[PDB]
Amino acid sequence: DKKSARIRRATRARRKLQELGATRLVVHRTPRHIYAQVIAPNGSEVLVAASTVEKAIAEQLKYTGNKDAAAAVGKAVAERALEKGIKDVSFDRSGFQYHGRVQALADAAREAGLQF
Amino acid sequence: RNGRDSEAKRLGVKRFGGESVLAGSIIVRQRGTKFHAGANVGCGRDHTLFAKADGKVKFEVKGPKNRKFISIEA
Amino acid sequence: MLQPKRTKFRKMHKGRNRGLAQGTDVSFGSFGLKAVGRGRLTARQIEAARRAMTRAVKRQGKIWIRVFPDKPITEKPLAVRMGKGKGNVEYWVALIQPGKVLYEMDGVPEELAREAFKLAAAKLPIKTTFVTKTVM
Amino acid sequence: GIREKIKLVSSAGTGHFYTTTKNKRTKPEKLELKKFDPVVRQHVIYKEAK
Amino acid sequence: AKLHDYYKDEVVKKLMTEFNYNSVMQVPRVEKITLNMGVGEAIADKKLLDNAAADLAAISGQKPLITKARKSVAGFKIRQGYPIGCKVTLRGERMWEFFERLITIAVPRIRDFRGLSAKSFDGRGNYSMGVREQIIFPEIDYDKVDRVRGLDITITTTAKSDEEGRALLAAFDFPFR
RNA sequence: GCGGGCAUCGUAUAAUGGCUAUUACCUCAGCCUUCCAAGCUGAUGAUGCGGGUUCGAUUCCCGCUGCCCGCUCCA
RNA sequence: CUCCUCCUAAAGAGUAACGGAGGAGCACGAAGGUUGGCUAAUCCUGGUCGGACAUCAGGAGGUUAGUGCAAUGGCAUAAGCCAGCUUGACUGCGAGCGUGACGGCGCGAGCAGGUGCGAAAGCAGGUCAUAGUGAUCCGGUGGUUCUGAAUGGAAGGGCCA
RNA sequence: UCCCGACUUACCAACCCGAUGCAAACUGCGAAUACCGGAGAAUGUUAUCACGGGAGACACACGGCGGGUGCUAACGUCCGU
RNA sequence: GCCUGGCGGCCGUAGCGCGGUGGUCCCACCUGACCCCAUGCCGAACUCAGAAGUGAAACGCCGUAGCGCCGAUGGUAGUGUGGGGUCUCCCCAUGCGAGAGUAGGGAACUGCCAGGCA
């Protein structure tokens, strides 16, 4: 019941981002990969996305799914959004504790430039 | 043994659907929710929904529980 | 006599008695005593007609009472004024619409039942007919 | 009702006080809070739960 | 320890054929064991449920958990929020070191232990038998204790029916009568 | 038209939340020729019945089984 | 006899009677704020004492629970439950409304000044909401260099609490 | 062997399952009307709002409809229209 | 073009049962936890390392109507306006018209990454 608990935590933080109308950087974490999307204020479809599942950011890495890999995506999703002109993004935990890989991914997007 | 009632609280819908409201206009006074705060609408401490923005009043059932929301559309 | 063992409220409003009944088919037995008039069946009347049916069939064959006295009728004492709160609950009625099956019966022949449902109908304040079960 | 009225007096030397209630028989600890003093426009410690 | 590694050799080739399983993730695994002391003597006295936690932090390795009461009842004069039981739960390789002491040490030393129960399973494949003696575990000893309070041990495993559970732990030489 | 206990054999405790506490009656025992008077040593209570709220009711909230003072008038 | 909740009340609001039922005259420095988690009642089975029920473990069940206090509207994004840190139970205001014959009462985004919570972003002007209350006068107590009956003070008054 | 309880009793009887009703303080449903808003045309001596001058009135009655109370009594009583 | 994953639209014709089924592509358990971290006890959970194993559980997809759920048509109830009959309560004209239940439907439908033959 790992996913049923996690979407219960997110679905209060997913709101106050629909009622605010904020661009959501959403992070999905999993044992061996790490995902991130940038989604428009509407709930419709994403603007930019980045992960380790692309083979660009596959063998640029020692291992997929650790904190140095999450900082690889952290530069990747941020540098690919600024070229589209998207900042003032809001980070969505999506039920994960902002502590480990997902802290390492939001930290490496704040360096690369995403206004939170 | 009986004989007591209270003053009537004048609850219910104050601005119905399609009505154009200013911001801050009270749209429904209620005790519980029975009406949830959609777009451009605050809930308030006694759950009095109110227009956060100018526009028209819009009721719609939406959600995984068929709950009645109230949006405001300019 | 019949009465609810408990209720959530001691007194009811008077209400009205508009409409037609919902339980109109002989559901359990073979022969029925359907109500064709409209009024109130006090629990004294339902019991008096329950004995008059049972005594006529000589304790033979099953007997259903399809109605229940669940309405508390109040009545103010004598020499008391109007007002001073609602009066005290003195008996219990069943509201009866046209079409209500009051009693049902099987296990007896029909001519013993039409005899026994004629003895019960003289105990009730409501005009009544004898109906038998229908497929559909 | 059976809660007395106390008088939260500021630490900033100004005479600005808040007033509030307190279960005196339950809680005998002097209630102290960091509240706002409009005379000095800083958050300061209010004390003296009467 | 090696009782944990008894699982990787001495059960798998042996319980692959007791039910003709599909996969090695099908072999009934042992998930947790919980060490309950239900102490209904902790309302009038308070200096003994800590004594029930004194040994439970020596019987098993860890600082024990005091449980609350979950519901105010009158048949036992407790409200809710009261210390009523004190359980410990054991996982990892430091549950099979404990479980080695329930095959090497414990079941020798139980009084009139002419048998080991087998109908004690709940029905889903979980064995929960308790011991009446807190003198039988040798971490604590003879010139120490005032009561003989004892405990429960619920074995939890990932079986489906209880004869998978009956034949899921006896393979670790847990005997039966 | 207020409601006070509906408490042990019997009478009085415990009526804003455990265990049930006095006094007689009593069953036994000793004094005495036998009774007394005694002096010792004990016995028992779904706490009228049953409903709620309660974690739990002698305890509250109604019922409601009788009762002791009530007041049922102005013409 | 004032207040709150339900029904009467006729699917907006309101609506009487010595109509039908209940409650209030508080509580809380946490039971408030926030942030991070969490999810019940009952039942079955297993069974150290342990019994219908203490605790533990599983299964069922899906809120029948819980909401400091009546009843109703709510409540899983929990408004329920647990800890971390805290004082926003802030000061000045307030577009705009709702509600009263009025006195009044209520809701309020936003702005200003400061503050708390996030190891980031992301809220808070008391509590799930609705009862928990008393106009004025007359005083009391602090504050205020507003008045200060010739002037300088003061007394008294005002204003603020 | 009071522990057995095998022998079974027109049975007290749950919870569940099926069928049958009733509710004002029941609602997994749900009208007609009424009410709010919007847009249209025709009609109506601005009927509508505001501000001001002067009022009276605040004992209502019955009749229809929806009801409370009463006895589905009252030329009864108390509301809504 | 099927397959998986995130985010949604939608809110039971979408749910549940029952049956079959999928692997390093993805996802899941899983290996280990020494430290970041953390359990009123447990690396269970959270979290961090890294892929030996398995698709058992979970999770998708495909079956099956067993259960929900959806559900006309006609009729009935009720009712606005108008006019009638009389304890109550109905009936006519006209307008609106259910609920329940039948027939039947129904095993949802849909906007980004990645995977593998195209």
Q: Which CATH number covers residue C79?
A: 3.90.1170.10
- Other Cβ atoms within 10 Å of B51 Cβ, number: 23
Nearest to E49 by CA among E28, E32, E34, E64: E64
Q: Phi/psi zone of residue C21: left (φ > 0), alpha (ψ -120 to 50 degrees), beta?
A: beta
In this structure, chain A runs to a length of 116
Domain count, chain C: 1
Q: Where are the beta strands (DSSP E) in chain C?
A: 31-35, 39-42, 62-65, 71-75, 88-96, 101-106, 128-132
- CA→C1' distance for B55 and H40 (Å): 23
Q: How far apart are CA E16 and CA E9, in angstroms?
A: 11
To 5 degrees, how large is the angle CA C62–CA C64–CA C69? 150
* CB C6 under 7 Å to nucleic chain F: yes
Amino acid B9 CA to nucleotide G139 C1' distance, rounded Å:
38
Q: How far apart are CA B56 and CA B42, in angstroms?
A: 15
**A56: nearest nucleotide, CA–C1' criterion:** I114
In DSSP terms, which residues pair with E30 in a beta bridge?
Answer: E157
For residue C15, being part of any structural domain is answered with: no
Q: Is the CB of E73 under 7 A from strand F?
A: yes
Bridge partners, residue E130, by sequence: E152
User: Which single residue is written with the structure tokens 């809660």?
Assistant: D3
Q: Give the distance from CA D43 to its chain's centroid.
A: 13
Q: Which domain holds residue C82?
A: 21-136
Starting at the edge strand found earlier in the chain, the sheet holding B12-13 runs B12-13, B26-29, B49-51, B41-42
Rg for chain E, CA atoms, rounded = 18
| Å between CA of B58 and C1' of G49 | 65
Sequence-separated contacts (24+) of E14-19 with Cβ below 8 Å: E14/E171, E15/E167, E15/E168, E15/E171, E18/E167, E19/E164
Query: Is the CB of C6 within 7 Å of strand H?
Result: no
Inter-CA distances, A116 with A67, A78, A107, B5, D37, Å: 20, 12, 10, 54, 33
A65 touches strand I (CB under 7 A): yes
Pair of tokens at residue E88: 């410990």
**CA dist., res. B59 & res. B36, Å (int):** 10
Cα E57 from Cα E66, distance rounded (Å): 12
The torsion of the CA quartet E99, E103, E106, E110, rounded to 10 degrees, works out to: 140
CA nearest neighbour of A108 among A60, A65, A72, A83: A72
User: Can you name the residues that pair with D44 across neighbouring β-strands?
Assistant: D35
Q: How far apart are CA B31 and CA A110, in angstroms?
A: 44
Q: Which chains touch B (3 or more CB pairs under 8 A)?
A: none
**What domain range includes position A16?**
1-116
| Three-state DSSP state, E17 | coil
Tally Cβ neighbours within 10 Å of residue C33.
27
Instruction: Report helix, strand or coil for C27.
Output: coil
C18: CB within 7 A of chain H nucleic strand? yes
Q: Helix, strand, or coil here: D25?
A: coil
* Cα distances (Å, whole numbers) of residue E69 to E76, E82, E85: 11, 5, 8
Q: Which bases of chain I are under 7 A from a protein CB atom?
A: 5-12, 26-30, 32-33, 36-37, 40-51, 53-56, 58-59, 77-78, 87-90, 111-115
Chains that touch E (3 or more CB pairs under 8 A): none
Tell me whether residue E63 is exposed, middle or buried, using C-beta atoms within 10 angstroms of its C-beta: 0 to 12, 13 to 18, 19 or more. exposed
* Structure token digits, residue B45: 């401490």
- Contact yes or no for A106/A113 (Cβ under 8 A): no
Record the tokens describing residue C76, joined without a space.
Answer: 């103010």
With b meaning 16 or more CB within 10 Å and e meaning fewer, what string describes D1-32? eeeeebebbbebeeebbeeeebeeeeeeeeee
Phi, psi of E170 (to 5 degrees): -70, -20
A23/A88 Cα distance (integer angstroms): 7
> Where exactly are the structural domains of chain D?
1-50
For chain B, how far is it from start to end, CA to CA, in angstroms? 54
A52 touches strand I (CB under 7 A): no
Length of chain B: 74
For tokens 């000893």, the residue is E141
Q: Which bases of strand F have any atom within 7 Å of the beta carbon of a protein residue?
A: 18, 51, 55-56
CA distance B35 to B48: 10
Nucleotides of H under 7 A from a protein CB: 19-26, 36-38, 66-74, 76-77
Q: Can you read off the two tokens belonging to residue C134?
A: 């229908």
Q: Which of C136, C134, C129, C135 is nearest to C35 (CA)?
A: C129
D32/H65 CA-to-C1' distance in Å: 67
Taking 3-state DSSP, the helix, strand and coil percentages for chain C, each rounded to the nearest 5, stand at 20, 30, 55
Partners of C31 in the beta sheet? C105, C132
**What is the distance between the alpha carbons of residues C103 and C124, in angstroms, rounded to a whole number?**
12
Distance between CA atoms of residues C96 and C43, nearest Å: 12
Q: Is D44 within 8 Å of D12 (Cβ atoms)?
A: yes
